[PDB]
């Protein structure tokens, strides 16, 4: 396995939950807004969002 | 038949990339010769005629 500069997890979770910051509960639609934050020195793939 | 939602969460899974490596890749992808591009698998105009 490679070592140096391939992985560090110094107090950073692999999974972050993000709870809504606005919500709407209309009869035919439910809207939810989030603040999706990607910290410094992190890259997020949007193919792992659900 | 009815449906109602209580709580919709967003879960985002970040790779724990090394910090120096992470911000090397930030520099590269904040340039306009490295701008990402996507396409639909079905690239089409969709028209329904009666």
């Amino acid at each position: 396995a490679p070592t140096h500069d391939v992985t560090t997890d110094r107090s950073q979770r692999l999974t972050l939950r993000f709870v809504p910051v606005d919500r709407e509960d209309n009869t035919y639609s439910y809207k939810v807004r989030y603040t999706l934050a990607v910290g410094d020195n992190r890259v997020l793939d949007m193919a792992s969002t659900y | 038949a009815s449906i109602s939602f209580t709580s919709i969460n967003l879960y985002a899974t970040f790779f724990p990339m090394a910090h120096n490596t992470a911000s090397t890749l930030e520099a590269m992808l904040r340039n306009d010769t490295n701008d990402q591009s996507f396409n639909d698998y079905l690239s089409a105009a969709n028209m329904l005629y009666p």
């Binding site: 396995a1 490679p2 140096h4 500069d5 391939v6 | 120096n20 490596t21 090397t24």
Partner: peptide, 22 residues
């Protein structure tokens, strides 16, 4: 065909790409 414990990159990532200190 391919299977697990054999997915080897060998090579690192960053300090080969020249950097020099302040």
């Amino acid at each position: 065909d391919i299977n697990f414990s054999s997915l080897a990159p060998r090579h690192g990532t960053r300090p080969f790409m020249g950097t020099w200190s302040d």
